[PDB]
Amino acid sequence: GNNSYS
Amino acid sequence: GNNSYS
Amino acid sequence: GNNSYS
Amino acid sequence: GNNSYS
Amino acid sequence: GNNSYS
Amino acid sequence: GNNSYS
Amino acid sequence: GNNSYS
Amino acid sequence: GNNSYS
Amino acid sequence: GNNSYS
Amino acid sequence: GNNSYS
């Protein structure tokens, strides 16, 4: 799917 | 702080 | 699925 | 801070 | 901070 | 999918 | 800061 | 997909 | 800062 | 797809 990393 | 939304 | 990492 | 949206 | 949107 | 890194 | 939009 | 890096 | 849009 | 780097 989608990845949001911070 | 930081926000990671998915 | 989707990954949200912070 | 930083924002990562997806 | 920095913003990454997708 | 899409990746948002910060 | 910096913005990356896609 | 699309990548937004910052 | 800098902006990268696509 | 498209890449936005900053």
UniProtKB/Swiss-Prot annotation, chains A, B, C, D, E, F, G, H, I, J:
Tissue-specificity statement: Ubiquitously expressed. In particular, expression is high in pancreas, placenta, lung, genital tract and spleen.
Domain of life (superkingdom): Eukaryota
Record's comment on post-translational modification: Hyperphosphorylated in hippocampus, neocortex, and spinal cord from individuals affected with ALS and FTLDU. Phosphorylated upon cellular stress. Ubiquitinated in hippocampus, neocortex, and spinal cord from individuals affected with ALS and FTLDU.
Coiled-coil parts of chain: none
Protein's cellular compartments: Nucleus; Cytoplasm; Cytoplasm, Stress granule; Mitochondrion
Related illness: Amyotrophic lateral sclerosis 10: A neurodegenerative disorder affecting upper motor neurons in the brain and lower motor neurons in the brain stem and spinal cord, resulting in fatal paralysis. Sensory abnormalities are absent. The pathologic hallmarks of the disease include pallor of the corticospinal tract due to loss of motor neurons, presence of ubiquitin-positive inclusions within surviving motor neurons, and deposition of pathologic aggregates. The etiology of amyotrophic lateral sclerosis is likely to be multifactorial, involving both genetic and environmental factors.
Assembly mode: Homodimer. Homooligomer (via its N-terminal domain). Interacts with BRDT. Binds specifically to pyrimidine-rich motifs of TAR DNA and to single stranded TG repeated sequences. Binds to RNA, specifically to UG repeated sequences with a minimum of six contiguous repeats. Interacts with ATXN2; the interaction is RNA-dependent. Interacts with MATR3. Interacts with UBQLN2. Interacts with HNRNPA2B1. Interacts with ZNF106. Interacts with CNOT7/CAF1. Interacts with CRY2.
Function: RNA-binding protein that is involved in various steps of RNA biogenesis and processing. Preferentially binds, via its two RNA recognition motifs RRM1 and RRM2, to GU-repeats on RNA molecules predominantly localized within long introns and in the 3'UTR of mRNAs. In turn, regulates the splicing of many non-coding and protein-coding RNAs including proteins involved in neuronal survival, as well as mRNAs that encode proteins relevant for neurodegenerative diseases. Plays a role in maintaining mitochondrial homeostasis by regulating the processing of mitochondrial transcripts.
Note on domains (UniProt): Consists of an N-terminal domain (NTD) and two tandem RNA recognition motifs, RRM1 and RRM2, followed by a C-terminal glycine-rich region. Contains a nuclear localization sequence and is mostly nuclear; however, its nuclear export sequence permits it to transport mRNAs to the cytoplasm and even to synapses as part of neuronal granules.
Record's protein name: TAR DNA-binding protein 43
Name of the gene encoding the protein in the UniProt record: TARDBP
